[PDB]
Amino acid sequence: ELDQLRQEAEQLKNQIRDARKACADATLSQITNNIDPVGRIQMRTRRTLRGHLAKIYAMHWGTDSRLLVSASQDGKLIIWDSYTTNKVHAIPLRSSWVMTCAYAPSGNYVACGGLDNICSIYNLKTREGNVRVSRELAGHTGYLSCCRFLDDNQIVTSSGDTTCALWDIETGQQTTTFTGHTGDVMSLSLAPDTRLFVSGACDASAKLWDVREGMCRQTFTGHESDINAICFFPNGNAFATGSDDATCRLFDLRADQELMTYSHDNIICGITSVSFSKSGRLLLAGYDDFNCNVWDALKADRAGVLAGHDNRVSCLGVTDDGMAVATGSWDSFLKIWNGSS
Amino acid sequence: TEDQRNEEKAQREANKKIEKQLQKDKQVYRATHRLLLLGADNSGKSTIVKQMRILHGGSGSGIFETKFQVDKVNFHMFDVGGQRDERRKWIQCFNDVTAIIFVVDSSDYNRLQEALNDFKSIWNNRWLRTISVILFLNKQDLLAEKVLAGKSKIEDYFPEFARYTTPEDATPEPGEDPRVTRAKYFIRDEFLRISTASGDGRHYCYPHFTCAVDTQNVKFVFDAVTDIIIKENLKDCGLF
Amino acid sequence: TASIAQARKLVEQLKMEANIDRIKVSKAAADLMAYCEAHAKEDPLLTPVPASENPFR
Amino acid sequence: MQVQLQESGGGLVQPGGSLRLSCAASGFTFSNYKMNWVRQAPGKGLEWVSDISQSGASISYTGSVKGRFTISRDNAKNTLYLQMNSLKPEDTAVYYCARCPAPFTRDCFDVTSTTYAYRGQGTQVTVSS
Amino acid sequence: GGVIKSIFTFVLIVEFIIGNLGNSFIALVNCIDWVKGRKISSVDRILTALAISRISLVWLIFGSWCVSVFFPALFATEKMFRMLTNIWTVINHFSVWLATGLGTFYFLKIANFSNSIFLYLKWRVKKVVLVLLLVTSVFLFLNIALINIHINASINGFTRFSSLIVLTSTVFIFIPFTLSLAMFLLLIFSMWKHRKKMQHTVKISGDASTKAHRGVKSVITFFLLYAIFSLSFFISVWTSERLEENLIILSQVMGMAYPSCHSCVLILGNKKLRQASLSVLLWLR
Ligand SMILES: CC(C)CCC[C@@H](C)[C@H]1CC[C@H]2[C@@H]3CC=C4C[C@@H](O)CC[C@]4(C)[C@H]3CC[C@]12C
Ligand SMILES: COc1cccc2c1cc([N+](=O)[O-])c1c(C(=O)O)cc3c(c12)OCO3
Ligand SMILES: COc1cccc2c1cc([N+](=O)[O-])c1c(C(=O)O)cc3c(c12)OCO3
Secondary structure: HHHHHHHHHHHHHHHHHHHHHOOOOOHHHOOOOOOOOOOOEEEEEEEEOOOOOEEEEEEEOOOOOOOOEEEEOOEEEEEEEEOEEEEEEEEEOOOOOOOEEEOOOOEEEEEEEEEOOOOOEEEOOOOOOOOEEEEEEEEOOOEEEEEEEEEEEEEEEEEEEEEEEEEOOOOOOOOEEOOOOOOEEEEEEEOOOOOEEEEEEEEOOEEHHHHHHOEEEEEEEEEOOEEEEEOOOOOOEEEEEEEOOOOOEEOOOOOEEEEEEEEOOOOOOOOEEEOOOOOOOOEEEEEOEEEEEEOOOOOEEEEEEEEEOOEEEEEEEEEEOOEEEEEEEEEEEEEEEEEEO | OHHHHHHHHHHHHHHHHHHHHHHHHHHHHHHEEEEEEEEEOOOOHHHHEEEEHOOOOOOOOOOEEEEEEEEOOEEEEEEEEOOOOOOOOOOOOOOEEEEEEEOOOOOOOOOOHHHHHHHHHHHHHHHHHHOOEEEEEEOOOHEEEEHHHOOHHHHHOOOOHHHHHOOHHHHHHHHHOHHHHHHHHHHOOOOOOOHHHOOOOOOEEEEEOOOOOHHHHHHHHHHHHHHHHHHHHHHHHHOO | HHHHHHHHHHHHHHHHHOOOOOOOOOHHHHHHHHHHHOOOOOOOOOOOOOOOOOOOO | OEEEEEEEEOEEOOOOOOEEEEEEOOOOOOHHEEEEEEEEEOOOOOEEEEEOOOOOEEEOOOOOOOOOOOEEOOOOOEEEEEEOOOOOOOHOOOEEEOOOOOOOOOOOOOOOOOHHHHHOEEEEOOOOO | HHHHHHHHHHHHHHHHHHHHHHHHHHHHHHHHHOOOOOOOHHHHHHHHHHHHHHHHHHHHHHHHHHHHHHOOOOOOOOOOOHHHHHHHHHHHHHHHHHHHHHHHHHHHHHOOOOHHHHHHHHHHHHHHHHHHHHHHHHHHHHHHHHHHHHHHHHOOHHHHHHHHHHHHHHHHHHHHHHHHHHHHHHHHOOOOOOOHHHHHHHOOOHHHHHHHHHHHHHHHHHHHHHHHHHHHHHHHHHOOOEEEEEEEHHHHHHEEEEEEHHHHHHHHHHHHHHHHOOOHHHHOO
């Protein structure tokens, strides 16, 4: 009866495709034909943040848009004050292989993870001095690719074991395990309302999970390679996925289908990191060609190029106030980029 | 104001302490070499980690790291065994390693093609084009014990062994049959044909047949690492 | 029976996904239009903030 | 759309026969993806068999299929072909076509993995007499 | 008399030309890479500094020759002579010690010695070369003092005096050169020991090794040729009490030999410069 289930799966997939085709009344490029072009946007490196030894794999901005946490492959988590390019804390890490870092929205805890399979949560505002490992979360049978804090107590971590998870820091145990991805879950982003989160995997898919319920609401397909960068629209009703097919794609939750594909013939490298500006008009995508590209989101025009990194730009993040964009590369450098009037 | 001035002075003092610690860490980091152990499950890579963990000290959760001191030169070996069989995404964490020790079973003849395909994949990665591979053809004793005993001729797989002669260079061990040499160097020549028929001038493959003597293996790793360091110094000096 | 269970889980998830209310592309694209237009003035990367107010001067 | 690779062909064939396995791929630009053929023998793991590059210039095989089998890559029809000459009982296996991970690359790893996204369901080739 | 003078003049013109093309090539290629946002290694920074210093030296020597032929009046003002000598001593000191600093860079990054001092200096190559220049500033000062002492003594009391100052500056260039040659020999010794170790260990070769060997042979050839030529010049000045009436042109050609020949060797040795030279040769054809 396996053949019967396969036939039923094919029929349901065809039905969903037909529903999507019915819902595709027009193409986003048609509605955004009348938009005045964003113009050539040229932001400069306001501050270069040096001090890391090995490559920088992931960075996260704090809610105050001033402190940023950076993970390096040498085993270092540095909390930089972007305004004065001064390092506040330099946490040594047990396992040097770090691929994710998170700043708690409360600005108290810093998360890290990687090839050690463990999400290490570090308390910064301790009763005493120094920075110590507040908690270590184990239970993921794969490399931790992205970890994000919901509150000061709950953290969602996506791992290479084709699984995302929700952890209670105090309990130290998984509360809800999100399964259904076939490939390794690489990037994970939360909605502005921390109710749903969309996770991109290596199976050329993204999935919209409900945090409390624990079920995969929708699955978005369309990429031809690994979705290795995810980022919610500031509205919360769309997201952007960067893949190794050298394409970014704007998927939409309500229509449950792609809206538009940002790609160019010149670029053949995969996209490393994807971030939406505060207004959602700009998609800053990091590429393997040692530079970032700023696309228009509503149109598909390449608004700008953030050249200035020697190696691939591994991490990219816009601040909550949108005033700056930090791009960290494999050359042990993060650069803050800001636009000049 | 005064309070702001005191806060900025404190921030600069913390930054200075962090910079001192980072300078010390940089000294240690440049004093240690990164070795990534890759190979099949039948290959004895874990045996290698244990062999040099209890020979010069070592650290001792997924990654089985170890750190030792061979003639004052620090080495940081590590094996990633806690992950899944998909490796296109975490292998990228090892682009700056000094070397990749690829341990090959070299005694089963069934997974040898799988080993060659893995070697090709490692050799051709954009993130591993600049990384030299120290190839450790392990299980030489078993290779011999099967080659003399007959039973399963190697010619069944890899048909080119029918039209293969022992390389004129050669280096047979004191007591050894010519057939053992031919099989051994045929496997090594398959690996070197995979290595050389690709990017040159950025990374090299160092072949070594693993023996029961541990000191020879550690010496080969040390010598290969020294060659890699000298070659990367040549490249950074623009004399290559 | 692992394949049977995997296929059953796949078809159950696909059934959950199929009967999901879906809005036309035009309406949701217009929503993205409205969000981009309403919040365009407060985006510093799109419209650069004066150096007096920019903290990365 | 979804990455799909449907394989067709394969069946009971007497030893020493020939058979064409056709993998029709949809959902991606067939042109710029190195493509492999991988089989799985019963009671055994997945073994890479052949690979062909984007333009078709580079074709590589294993020892057991060095001269017997051939690989064709029709870009216009978005199809891959494995021609199977002088079949042997050692070839009784489930055959899959694998679009290896990244475009414009030949350094692709997870083609023989236990679980792999861009791999077809496959066709069962039995060479029972 | 006239024949040797004309021969030396033609040799001087050729040295001017090859120095100009070589050093302008180095400076232009590195500046092109810089303005185009390409890689800028420390070795090409030292190459830029060396090329600029060498082109300045070549300009100074050719201006000296222009003064001595096309306007032979300011050459004997007893003040322009001292001024030219002092500027040449300063620029040549900077250039020769920068070449020795490039040698120290190569030695401290490529050589593999087990001695504790070598490792201690190995991790501070920029500090080592900067300290080298700042220290050898004492050699610069003492050379300037000795040249000035000799010129004042001659003025108070010039072919023998010119010979003696030629000898003094030749010594002050021989010291950095001998240090650079000894350091190159130590690097070659490290190469030989490492090759012996890997031959015992078994290792394969390639085309890049062949190119590196060609570069090493070129550098050895240049060092030997310069050593024999400069020793010949020193012996000719010291011994030939005939005063060698045309000593000035010989001094100019010997002074300009280094900034041209060594720039050519550096072009042929550096991988980036070699690729640029091949590209330019292809573009010409
Ligand atoms: C052999 C190697 C070290 C090169 C040596 C070059 C030295 C010896 C050369 C280069 C520049 C030369 C000087 C250039 C111009 C003049 C002015 C003239 O009225 C007297 C000779 C005098 C003062 C030369 C003396 C020799 C000199 C200093
Ligand atoms: C292909 O060129 C080189 C290859 C390897 C070494 C050297 C070298 C070229 C030069 N050089 O500049 O002609 C030097 C010098 C020098 O002459 O400064 C001094 C040295 C050297 C080298 O090795 C250590 O000491
Ligand atoms: C301690 O070992 C060395 C010290 C100093 C130089 C070299 C060297 C070792 C090697 N090597 O790798 O054997 C080389 C090679 C080569 O053989 O690649 C080519 C070169 C070299 C060296 O100097 C310039 O050209």
